[PDB]
Symmetry: C2
Subunit: 248 residues, 2 copies
Amino acid sequence: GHMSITENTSWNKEFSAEAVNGVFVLCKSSSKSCATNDLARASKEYLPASTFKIPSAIIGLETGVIKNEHQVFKWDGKPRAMKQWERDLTLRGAIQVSAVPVFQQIAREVGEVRMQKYLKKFSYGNQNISGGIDKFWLEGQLRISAVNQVEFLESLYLNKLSASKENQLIVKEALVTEAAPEYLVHSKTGFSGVGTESNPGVAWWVGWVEKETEVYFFAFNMDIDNESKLPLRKSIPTKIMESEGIIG
Amino acid sequence: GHMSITENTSWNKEFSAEAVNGVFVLCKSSSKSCATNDLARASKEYLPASTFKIPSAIIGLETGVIKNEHQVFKWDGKPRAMKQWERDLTLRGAIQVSAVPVFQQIAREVGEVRMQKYLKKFSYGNQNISGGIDKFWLEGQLRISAVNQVEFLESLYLNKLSASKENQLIVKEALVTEAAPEYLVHSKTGFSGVGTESNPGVAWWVGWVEKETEVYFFAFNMDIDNESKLPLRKSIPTKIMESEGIIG
């Protein structure tokens, strides 16, 4: 891209408090003005986990696998890994509750050939989908950096991905997580799991904030080996955005 | 259209509690299953006031007067009737804070001819934009019923208005007023003024609620001659919707 990124070690204060190894990337207006606590980690690539439901939803719409925004994903009554998935869901519903089996079936119907095509068009991380069509974003070799997330979300915000504008808009409405008269957040979490010995998992929070006529893009990730640390994925970025005057 | 509407006089309870003359229309799934406290008033046409900045936004975008969803509406410094308008505004911001001058200006640009044609394509009320190219929906001759509002909003929800799908989606995102996992409200208020004792003005609340995989369309209006009653345009529909198990 044409990203211009400045390291700002003052942000590390928010991480040391809870002994978190992670990165926050925050861009005002565009990728031409980004800041981070850690330039090295900003460009390091991790498993996307549920953040991948953003490209996946757009690819589902583009291919016709998802017929339109009113598509209902019916639950077959068989056990699913979380109780909050054991129910019929809309597209927004499935994204918001990170309904993995819904997106596993989307991925299967999209198929390897089309999936590869679109991750190339989107410049989505290392674009490596190998090893199983219904789990490459969960435990396979797909990797993306915080910098790449921000660039990808900026394109989405601008309707500049190689997808119809209407498909980008549908997926954006599905990502709205806070709506006030002059404060709108689009965001998505992810969590790969707790990893293995000496190879922690990754937790994500990515999105953008529209406050007045200003827009801020963000991507956070952190190493995680314990599920009780999970809420830090939103609290640390929230604190940093508060200190910048974005939130509150 | 094909609306099927049943009168249920029990709802009148939440009106008489407050000495309000008004109507509420509430439809589950589609206009094929609607209910109201008062059939006659449901079809009676009133000034849309700020609820007109839904069709006018679409018209704005369809005509080119609004270039896209990222257009900024620049303030000029000159006073406006309220403080919250004295600032630049996104399309969303202006809808959500209900910036009359922004929309006055949009109407002027679209002009009477284009406005007439589109209000006809949209079957919007009595389609009378007389005596105020920039005032017809606030003081002029334009009238629309609760039933018509509902049918219009369902059209918008389904992307079935005579406008590109993308413009419908742009305006829909601007109407989001509440966003939770599994609960999404799109909505828009209106007021027109306190009028007289003989001829009181009207207050509106219109929109839809997506809950689980269900959708509910609503339109409320009421007679209003005292500004202190203005929040009832929300509390009465809210109480009716709660008792239907909707406000989760």
